[PDB]
Design a protein around this ligand. Structure first.
Ligand SMILES: C=C1CS[C@H]([C@H](NC(=O)/C(=N/OC)c2csc(N)n2)C(=O)O)N=C1C(=O)O
Length: 261
């Protein structure tokens, strides 16, 4: 195994948990994988697929992102800091996508899922763009239970990195849609301690975090260094104890190890 894989394996061993990494370097389209074909609970990193699926819908329904969506008291689930500010009012699908992506808003994700016809509508878009691995099975908040061995609401690092590349750097989405997703990811507020923390601060990053049961702590990112082609990096992490604490430091250190090599 490679030098970078030995360092990631050592980071994993020091952490007590299970680490999954996929890097795509688009300069030479080379890859670094660590447990790259293992399934991991996506938690909120699945919100990228849901937001992109609604963006795909907007390529035919041109005004879709401006459509108001009612926020009812019954719709509110925990960890919905934006949607809770609009109960008994409305948010547009663009505002709900930005809330889901940039504040990890769970109610906002549920509105995206409903716009897509349920969790099967999110999986549907994954399959449409060639991702045979992603599966969304539940709504918020239960999709983050992150139970060991449970295949629901999982993907592999290899699949998610390839999908994130297609959605942002590729053209799985239309031109305005692709640029909109990139802007949303670049404006994420929840990732300062995760992949971003392990990379040189001159680099531009768009990312989406996730967290859940079993101390599951995730981040998926597109990375624009100055002077070289972009990178796609997925870092998934999960732990043996159901009540384990989040470990965003592991994602930061994984990104740092990757950036070194
Ligand atoms: C900032 C947050 C927290 S709310 C969101 C969501 N996670 C949960 O609601 C969750 N469910 O637990 C069963 C959770 C959050 S913290 C913990 N120990 N568990 C998600 O991942 O979509 N995501 C992020 C994030 O890190 O991006």
């Amino acid at each position: 195994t490679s030098a970078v894989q030995q360092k990631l394996a050592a980071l994993e061993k020091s952490s007590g948990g299970r680490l999954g990494v996929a890097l795509i370097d688009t300069a030479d389209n080379t890859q670094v994988l660590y447990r790259g074909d293992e399934r991991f609970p996506m938690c909120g990193t699945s919100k990228v697929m849901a937001a992109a699926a609604v963006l795909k819908q907007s390529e035919t329904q041109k005004q879709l992102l401006n459509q108001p969506v009612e926020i009812k008291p019954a719709d509110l689930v925990n960890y919905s800091p934006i949607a809770e500010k609009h109960v008994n009012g409305t948010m547009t699908l663009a505002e709900l996508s930005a809330a889901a992506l940039q504040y990890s808003d769970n109610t906002a994700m549920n509105k995206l899922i409903a716009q897509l016809g349920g969790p099967g509508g999110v999986t549907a878009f994954a399959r449409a763009i060639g991702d045979e691995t992603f599966r969304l099975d539940r709504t918020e908040p239960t999709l983050n239970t992150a139970i060991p061995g449970d295949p629901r609401d999982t993907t592999t690092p290899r699949a998610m990195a390839q999908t994130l590349r297609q959605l942002t750097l590729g053209h799985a989405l239309g031109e305005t849609q692709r640029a909109q997703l990139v802007t949303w990811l670049k404006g994420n507020t929840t990732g300062a301690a995760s992949i971003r923390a392990g990379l040189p601060t001159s680099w531009t990053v768009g990312d989406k975090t996730g967290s859940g049961g079993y101390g599951t702590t995730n981040d998926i990112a597109v990375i624009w260094p100055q002077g070289r082609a972009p990178l796609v990096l997925v870092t998934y992490f999960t732990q043996p104890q159901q009540n384990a604490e989040s470990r965003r430091d592991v994602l930061a250190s994984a990104a740092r190890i990757i950036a070194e090599g």
